[model samples]
Target chain A: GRPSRRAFVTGLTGFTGRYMAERLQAAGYDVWGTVAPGTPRPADPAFAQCTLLPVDLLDAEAMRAAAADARPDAVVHLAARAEPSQTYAVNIVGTRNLLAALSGLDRRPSAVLLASSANIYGNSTAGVLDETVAPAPANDYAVSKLAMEYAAKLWADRLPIVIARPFNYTGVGQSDAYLLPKLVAHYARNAPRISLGNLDVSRDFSDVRDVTAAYLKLIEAAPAGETFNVCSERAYSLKEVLAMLSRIAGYVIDVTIDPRFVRHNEVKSLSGSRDKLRRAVGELPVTPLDETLRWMVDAMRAA
Target chain B: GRPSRRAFVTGLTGFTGRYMAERLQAAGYDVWGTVAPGTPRPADPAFAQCTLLPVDLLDAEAMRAAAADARPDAVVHLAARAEPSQTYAVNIVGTRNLLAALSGLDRRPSAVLLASSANIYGNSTAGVLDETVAPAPANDYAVSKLAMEYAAKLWADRLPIVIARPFNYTGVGQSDAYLLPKLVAHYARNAPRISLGNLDVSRDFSDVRDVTAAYLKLIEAAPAGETFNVCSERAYSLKEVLAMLSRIAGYVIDVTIDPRFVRHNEVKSLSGSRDKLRRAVGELPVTPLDETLRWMVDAMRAA
Candidate 1:
């Protein structure tokens, strides 16, 4: 009688999505995931067995039909407009259409988990800020995510909506377009120097594996309209993350400060409460961050 | 030099947009505004002479073309998705398109006057909060406004973006959706009886004419990436405004509490600071809010 429910996850091909899918599958729940077409998808031998359909969250009609066919017991809406440039279209509009599809279901999911970001706290927002802190997004990306959370809050009564605001995390498959990958790639290329900004600025970073488990816990524990921040409650500076990378690379590399490397008017300290994430999951899954970094370095080297 | 240069007002049909357009015309500048096709526009006779075009803020290409054609000396970006539900799409994406259009212009406006709201102070946001105090949005309207601030802050180098955070104001043709109009309608229908909510809820209600003058002041001051609270700097409860309405009706009416008049989740206190507004503009543009309310009451009774 435990975990008979099915979990449908969007943004399943991304690093966190894949990890969440794997974790949910291991938990004895039937897990189905969405993959965008064309972009190189993560290779999961078992994806063929699970529901891996081609869908873009922006396409409302297609997503609605997909949701009907999947007949998911629950949906973890994760597909998002990942950047600030197109955030409104992707995060706000995308979430709007997805939630609309889920709105009038005969047998609605017990919970609709929204994969949110901790960045809602504008770059400088910190100090005991909780779900109650009015979001002061410094950038468009954060605003879009914050707005999506607001949209979900409006319709939570239809079904339980859980907002998971997770901060930094890294793993093997992370695209170099992101921070960790770019840092590691620069070091590997032995670029005379690397670019980094405001190295002293701190961020709450967690392992993708731990973050994935947090998603599962959210599904099980949260009630409607509840917002929780999934963070490591740990702050790591770019200098520290870089030093660790240098250790893994076993080379003394010149670290250069590219003018653009300085964090561009970003919030200096980004932190969140991990208590909710821990309480929901019962136990914090500790995937050593150094180990995760090493795995990424090795994977990138091989590539 | 006599006429200065043409002014571009984004929300020309809006209450304040029309006022700003009139001020620009008085200041000897050719005035132009943007409105979506078929939007029931502001009826100020001065606005009748202003040039208006169909420029959806979210339509990047259309907005860019219009901006190039207007080539304004001053820009007031007020076109927003403001209806509570509509705020998300228009406020967030519309601002994005607006900023993008501004960035693309060959020569940007000398003064970029942005329409911010005290609602960013969460309507009920209490205390001596200023531009520095973090924004606490009550609804999507505030959220989008905050997002617009963030986007405009990025382009401050290109143009001086003065955020004018105006508090509540009332005048003719104001819809039932707003507070004063509802009070007018209620008082008109029942001459001897006035039903209203807690009359103790204070607000810094200003006259719209005063707001137009403030917009002109901020534009002349040219404070870049700064916020000024354009309020009457006096708080009046809903009951007081309603009582004033009954007085204008020339009868002492019964005032009673009506829970139905209560908002979904009302805040305790909301008052704004004109410190920055005063400092930026040198003084408050005094207009009798009482007179404006009397006009509304008189119109409603005639109806």
Candidate 2:
């Protein structure tokens, strides 16, 4: 009989991590994950089928020990700090420690997927960014993410590393701090108004489910030393999203352009061309923005 | 009367730092530098004119206090760790802390010269590299330096930052661990044999004095948010360097290509164009390789 496949994920308690765990488990793999040392067990029932290890990425010893113990057939690294002040240390250094640990293991995993962000292509005039476009990171978060990719290059020879630069993705559990979730929350609450920045901005939006599915497929394919844009080749404006939510909730909510919320160096339009990603994993099942909006609104209302 | 200028330098005890401090002192500026904690005061008389602060770049609080105290008119950040394992932490994070500290100060520096490396353009087939060549860092050290540049972008708006990508340079005080210095030491000692790596590979070499002179000129110009290649625009093969050393030492030494010393992915040729640097800070005096080798040989023999 074949040995059971084991999948290890970092940040398994995070929003995308939860979905990834569920998907991996359903695909006949035993899911194991790393969570913050003090994190309580997640409330989701799906987590019960997975084993969670409390490991801080900064603690090299702990990460090394955990990586050796897991001995996963596939690995997905999703944990990263987005805050500007902490981004460099946690994202760059943290990823470095994890990769080093994995490289040291005797039974190295066949696939390691590092979840990078397409925000690295900050303020690019390119209508549809691909992997070849030179990165022009504008903010600390974007810079840190790009740095993480460079740092990961140090271990590319030792590990089967595949980088996934997911664009703007959202779903039911996404925090309200994000654009789509904020709009969905306001509509779910039947609020009269919402405040946001850059009303004219458009972005390549993908469903979290589709993003996780791509992650799984990429892990399965294990295109080592390759980078793919995990995005839907579609752009959605803030106005379009609002209209979709209005249709989903059967009402229209006001959107005020708060000058304070508007960023001076805000990217006018950020979209990605997923042709490379499509070729790597064939064609993925993309969820329509309307359907995604409805799913978030319904979930927010249910909660 | 105008106030006396103060120049703050990180890694004031390092090879390039010592030369920079001397040049800055001669330029009529009060040189202040950060030395590693517990470092003994150098016996060099030039350091007597400068103040030394025991500041660790990893300690953000200490860096902030040092920057506040110095209130430098010009800054030269030359401190970095090159070891593959510690490169990211000390080179990238350490630089972040120093920049954050400087940015928070009331009196900001007019010229902040960050010393990056041409190693970032690893294994490029370009005969003569310029500032426009895209970085393809091959190892952790190069990756960390590139990451440091990206991290420094966050402070471009706040700090008058000029990046200098210096190619291989050697001087009197350089550690023998480096290629040129090791060769100089062997020749100075009249060694019978020397073990070395690939002799076919070539690199752009400059005198430490010329490099420091360029740094002083760059500080005087204070071109913010610009990166320049500080190179001689001439490539020298190991065979050429050996011939020069033979003339300087008045004897020839046997050379052996140690299997272990040779790197698998060694860069065949690395040269840079100084057009951008010349445009920024007008033409400066350059020392010939023969003169540089003689200087190192005489200094090593004297020591």
Candidate 3:
């Protein structure tokens, strides 16, 4: 039997999706991807080597048609609306649509990995937050992700459905609206000041590369009904991360206080630990924060 | 000032809907109701006095228009598609559509008490389950209900929403598809045999009147952020329930094992105990199963 496994990846145009595609390709797995029709995507050279389709998980018919056509051995459902209010549609009903489509597949994908988030665990202080922790989702964003978990469990029960809740992560091509990207964009521009809400909250952060690698490691040999957290054991205050980014740019920006940037109601701490993940994928040396920041700065510079 | 409480009921045309409407109406709350467009409804005096809207929850815009038009203070979202598959679109998405409608109303219904079921908490031998236990839902039907709980939590956090998991109940006007109705129809015909599977597996059966009264009780007073099991606290095996019905009918039909009816892949047992329910509703006496069966037999014979 061939040792290599074939898998499908959703969100291939996304930063983490791009990273996952490269890793799966490098790891010698046959790979295909899905992207929404109108979402902006990177050049094909990075994705041209692999097959691609315009598939929205929300459109049940299109998803079923696409899934049948691809007939990939495994699937990674990372495609979601990713907006707060809009997530109710894409995240909740969107997940239902994808599951409905997958259920109709001739043979259910051998391994189905869902891209859930650490936010689903919502500040679980007792570190080893595994598949057992009920989703204490905090925001509408987390609720959307949690809803996906619900649908995934329902429709894909017969198959090996894996859930990966990657904590805060960042890399090049990531949106500047994200925390790390926002922090770096301000510093890279040598802006007179950087404004943000309470930055003292502790967060477990990782990089796009490690996050995607975890997804691949998970796909190869995870048991059915497994939930994994892709997170760092360490926690960093937003202030500390911003300072590091500032050092990388060799420029200091005024750290202005902006309460508006804060959550309407923010959880005090999110110190997620991936000890269970370490057992599954082994200890991953985190991508140096400075490197991730510099890549964001360089990407922004090129833009 | 103004009245502290007013109740709204949706889906007043259907079987369970009418029962819920009557219960809420008798409770002295400002009550109103909505039914599907062009669907036939009861011509009873109580129904004649009720505000009936021909609307579908699938239409977000129309639901909002209806909500704006009626604007009841509290909402009992009894409207749901009971199918195992279509249940998600109706129960999950349907609940979201109604919640979306609620957002548009100036008088957002403070309490959204949903007719959820313990089917969501479906693990075998959970020892007469409670709302506090984590649900081990088994199928799409259960998953859809669980998703509704997620959406309801968000809506409730923004407004006031309480979910009621009304496990296995039977009553007058109840259609034959339900277990009790099916039993009544089978025994009435003296069908040489009644088909069944896993006769030993049991469920906490309640009367629709009691369950509907529980809804009213919760609406008038159940704490916000609280969920309750509106089961009778009495678990009965399918064989026992059918036997009870047979005794009331004064004949026993042969019980034949039907594999198709069996949940080969299932939670070994199903049940719920409504202790919190009794505390909240104040000494909810047991509903006589014989009387309920007699009512179904009489109603079927009258029909």
Candidate 4:
């Protein structure tokens, strides 16, 4: 039998990384991923097939060693730090280090997908943003992500780099801190009331399953130096999301506006045009918001 | 007598840094600067009064110590590496280290002037760029500078940062590798011919003295989070520069086109608007290109 192709994933234990590992393994690729040092291996059976290597993105030497050991056929960089103080170091500089490590490899990956966020297009007035919308990052996290994209440009000539600007996405096992999971948990528990921020904010949401699928397609296609907006082309307001949750959980929860939950310079609406992504990888299967919410609710109830 | 107001300048021995030190001293600042480790103190008497600290920008702890010792009232970060390989490390990450160093100081400088290049507005169709011009960096150096700016945005809230995008400028000690100095050196030596590329390329030129003067004014004014274009508001083509050198050296030099000297994706023209700069610092004294060329020519002949 021939040796299985290898896919290297950074942030293996992360929500997205876990799904990516499963997808890559199902595609007949041997999945290898990096978990931060001191992070215990997950108990989930899905990650049982993944070969997890403990590596710190900030440690350049360790990253180089890991890359050499993995010698992946494909790469997906999903590791990032969200804390404002460490965001630039981990996102921009760390990404640079990863690319540098990869460049030294005897056998480089065919495609390296760098996970950039749609948050970089901060508060865009453009109804549906494609890849070309000028970035005006409103916060440190967004600024760092944009800076990472620019930093990646330095390596475009040497590496087959593809950037993915995924909008909001959520699914089962997502942290309760995120919007959808928080709401879904409330509905699953049949909470009488929930406190939230501005209810008018709208976001283009996608099922994590769908996002991973898009990522898989992009990795297979491997368009170098190209950026794509991975989204479902539809936005849902917070009120609408709550109404959908009510239908799924069979309960309407009361809501209260918590000033503390409100964010400064909050984006009013975010909708993405996946046309460029579709053109590159063909149409993707999208799960409706209600269906995705129900899956999360069921998982939450089971837990 | 009250302690002299301190001004810290990085890259003190570089062409711009030397002039900046003189300007700060003339304005009654006790100048302290960082020279790369192992760089000998300059024999030039102009730097005699300045304190040179041997430090590497890549050394974060050294930077923090220098910042604490200097405790500057003003900072002008002029140090940078133009080599594509080290550009991001020295420009973006180095600048961040400098800012981080300053942030720890109990007595922070009132203003930090980060020197960004006008090259960031790469190949602009817009005739004269202002602070608001969208950056379309054409190369790694420009990309790093733009990235540095975005990285600096992360520190804007904690630090008083004023960004200056200076256009091309040349003077007596400017490196001969640069366009203007190369022309000046050829003419001063009475060379019969010069090899050149893309004579149609135009650039906004300022005397280094004038540029330092703008830097001084910006540091004094200390407008936080503001970006200004420090330019002469006029552009001169290579032909025009050669003509000026001819008049200065009292002879016309033959020119040969060298394909190796021609850059790919060269910017056709670059000019800037100084309206915002004027509003911040009032009217500044301007140096005519002919006079600047003559100064360089005379200095070259004497050397």
Candidate 5:
């Protein structure tokens, strides 16, 4: 008999955490997750029903205890140190600790999904990257993610692990530090002028709903020891994103290039091939950029 | 002007540590090294002249303090966890800590060398493995070294980091747990019978002196951001090693195959190509196996 749908999510109080939990809950899963000790108390309705465990990814004993209590059938490890300087601590070491915790489980998880980043493909002129392309991570964050991926390979025999390299994704709850969200927030405020980095760079963008859905599909199928790109296979220049936001908000926003906002190691263009993603989970609903931006524009204004 | 030779060696009290320190001492360079806290005080006279610093690779503050004190021009990071289960802590995380500490130095070292392992070329049927082959680590220890190698590359710009993947090599003071040391000890004891693993498995063996010599050569003419095989390009089967040992000892010993001794995932043969090593740091003397074995035999018997 199939056990009642159970999924363990790390970083359960963060942006995508709520979205992932909503999806899992809608899919009839008994969602349990972890929040770092300092993570703000979740006022989000999505977090209301979910049992949130307190465990820092680096705290091995706490993670082990969480795993023992939850005994999740599927694990979505989303906790990572997004800060460049702190990448090795939470991303690499933290990931190792989480994996170690999962390994110690009496009935180990059958499905483990790690959230890596498409940024691992550093400054690729190649039109579209699939799982086949070799990684050349440009910065510390990307390097940490790649290091995490390689480290996970060591546990291939023990855990039925699936690695997902998500490119650029943004939604309502996403932090303003991220480009799209910051832009969207600016437009929501209807600011006089937007300060920005290089507007010429392009990226593969996805709706968190679409990305989170793919995660569920992966967990359901449980493709053991494989990597998949969770992306919309569409490259939209920041210029296009701004234009779409303007159209959605019914106004053209003036923009100013801020050298401070520009990243020295920025990848000018990044696009992923969703062929592998499609093959694994069939054709995912291609949420239109206009639609996604419109939804965010309205959500941001409301918030 | 190049600063006077002041080299810092981690693992200063271990097997190859004394040998490396001796090489540094003999070459008219000042040697400083670190031993783990609670490690029995080095009674050896070789360490008498060399300053022993206290820096646990895991302790960022302690390592940074030591680096500030030594202000080393060259650093040989020889410290690593040899045990399989504990590889992640001392090898991967510890190496990261060391690199992090080095990165914090006021005057960065001109040369940094990390001791990786040839076991990273897991189960290679290829006659001669080199730095080019993709690593497929068979065990956690190999995985940790490979992870350490990957992690070290991130510091290429800050430090003149050189990676050395030394193949299996043994000499006096190597624990009897290793094959060569155990065989030598058994022969020295003139044991009636010897328990063994897969005698057919072949490995590239070098004298620790030769290996230590390469490290010094690398430190002198540091090739920034390069990986080299620190090995003698020769492969000898365990059977051949036993034969040589017997010949050197002037007697034959009976052997019994212990299933427990044999590794299920043991690599059948491993030989490294010195092409890159030589090109990077000129020719190295390849000590004859007979001479090396005879020296070990005499040393073991004398002990």
Candidate 6:
């Protein structure tokens, strides 16, 4: 089992995928990944370890070919159409294609972990939302993730599938367009001001590394027909995040409220309960948010 | 606007589609319908009034062509792949393709009603499940319907979309494979012993005609961003159904339990609340179950 153990990561070139591959590789599992077809491989050394396969998630034949070749023991499906408009195609249909491809493989992966979003718990007031809370997804992105989770349930009889509803997590490689990275980048360059919306909004923010580690732990256990919240179980407001960045970078930046970024029915606070995850995997080292922020700030400074 | 009022029906040859088309035609709407590519047009007299277009829901180009040709003011999307294996393709992906096709049209339909199922309220003990109840979809079929509802929310900005969660409805044209129709047919034939599974199970049953009427009312209102339960708000068990058929046929029939018919985690009693739908269409006549069963018996006898 040790010699032939392999893990397949869809969207291995993605922000979370890099950390996941690195962790899996470090654990002595052969890490294989997929990059979208027609896209050139990244020059970044972070993606150097994993064997990258150029394939489209919607292309059944290509995915089938890749799955047949790799014969992975565990699968991490992180590839998704994060864009709001393309949710149906990338998130729902793309996921279906990937599952179909895996089903057709000769040596099916023992454990499969599909990445879902905590956004599915849209506008919930439940303190420390647990798996028992009914999902009320707000946006198309969240709706698509919830829909994908629904679609994934059909494959439970065939595959050892587990769904992880990960809350917001950011790291070094994530694009600056995201909240944390944007703030980190702005502070790293010592920008005079920054624009954002809904500074009062809070989320169960997890470090991407910690989140991926949770994914690895989930895939290792492969508890079929289960949903887990892969989160730090800690809430951080954008204002608090700004303060944290300011503290780390030793600078304060003017923040402007961008009306365009404000959602109509914005969820002011979102947090997940870690009880279920802790029950599944005995106490995980939840990396401190300040330390994670410091690492991102330093990484941005170095870049 | 009244002169060119047109209604388009997907799955025009299906059990419920025929009734919906007939009702729309009577309401002075020019009716158009979709049949799958290469499938022969139905010779049934019920389908003669509507023009049939050969289009698969999954084929975006064909759907676009059909939509363009029809230029309908209203649409009743009922063509769904009910198979568990193809639920993702036919229900979710197919609905996405159809919606995508409609988006390409210059003159979009004024009102579009999508058929969802009450099965989305999975294994619930709630006496009267309503639109407000959180969905706990159990199977692929139920999940696909819920997912379609979520996906349709994305199109709310562009289309006047209404979702109707119709509970189990059966009528003359329905196959004997369905519980009500099967029992009706068997009693009509005076079969000595009938084999069934889970005679204790109950459902909120409706006549296809009543269900179609609900759709028309919903389409006429064209309530955007609303979900309504198209049900009779009455419950009937299989035992009661069997008893009714026996009374109608003037004979008592022996019953045998078949293990094959039993579903794992079968929902014992499935009923939907009519409160939301009643608010939209005031005091609609709910046809009696005895009358529906009698109509089925007569229809079966005629055949």
Off by over 4 Å in 5: A1-3, A37-41, A56-65, A83-89, A92-108, A123-127, A138-140, B1-3, B37-40, B83-97, B100-107, B124-127
Candidate 5 per-residue lDDT over residues B110-195, each given as its tens digit: 89988888888878878799887877776666766776777677777788999998988887788888888888888888887898
What tens digits encode model 5's per-residue C-alpha lDDT throughout A1-303? 333768899998888888998888887878999987876777888788888998977778898899989999889999888733356557766887888888988999989999999888877778789887867776667777886787788788789999999988878788888888888888899887888888888889999989999999998889988899888988898799999988888898999898997877666777888888788888889788788888888998786
Model 6 agreement with the true structure over B162-244: per-residue lDDT tens digits: 99999889888798778888888888888899888888888899998898888988888998889898899888988998888
For residues A55-146, could you state the per-residue lDDT of candidate 4 as single tens digits? Answer: 98988889999999999989999999973436667887788889999989998889999999998987888979998898877666887788
**Candidate 5 lDDT (Cα, whole model)?**
0.83
Using DockQ as the measure, which candidate wins?
2
Stronger candidate by DockQ (1 vs 3): 3
DockQ of each: 0.24, 0.54, 0.38, 0.28, 0.27, 0.39
Q: Count the backbone clashes (under 3 Å) in each candidate.
A: 4, 0, 1, 0, 0, 0
Query: What is candidate 4's lDDT per residue for B25-91, written digit by digit as tens?
Result: 9899999999999866688888888888988998888999999999998999999987343676688
Better of 4 and 5 by DockQ: 4
Minimum summed lDDT over a 10-residue window in model 4 chain B is located at B83-92
Docking class of 4: acceptable
- Candidate 3 structure quality by residue, lDDT tens digits, A44-146: 4778667788887667788778777777677887776652345666776676666666677778777788888888776565645555677777656776687
DockQ score, prediction 2: 0.54
Tens digits of per-residue lDDT for model 2 on B243-285?
9999888888999999988878777887999999888778888
For residue B31, model 5's alpha carbon misses the true position, in angstroms, by 1.9
A131-241, model 2: which lDDT tens digit per residue? 999988877788888988888976878999999999989998889888788898899999999888887788899999999999999999999999999888898888988
lDDT of each: 0.74, 0.89, 0.74, 0.88, 0.83, 0.85
Put down candidate 1 lDDT per residue, A1-303, tens digits, no spaces: 435568788887766777777887887777776778677855667464466878887778888887776667777887876635466767876777777777867778887899878777765555545566666566667767876776566566577888888778877677888888888787666666766667887787787888888778788775676778887777778878888888988876676677776757666676777776565567776776678788877877787
Candidate order by decreasing DockQ: 2, 6, 3, 4, 5, 1
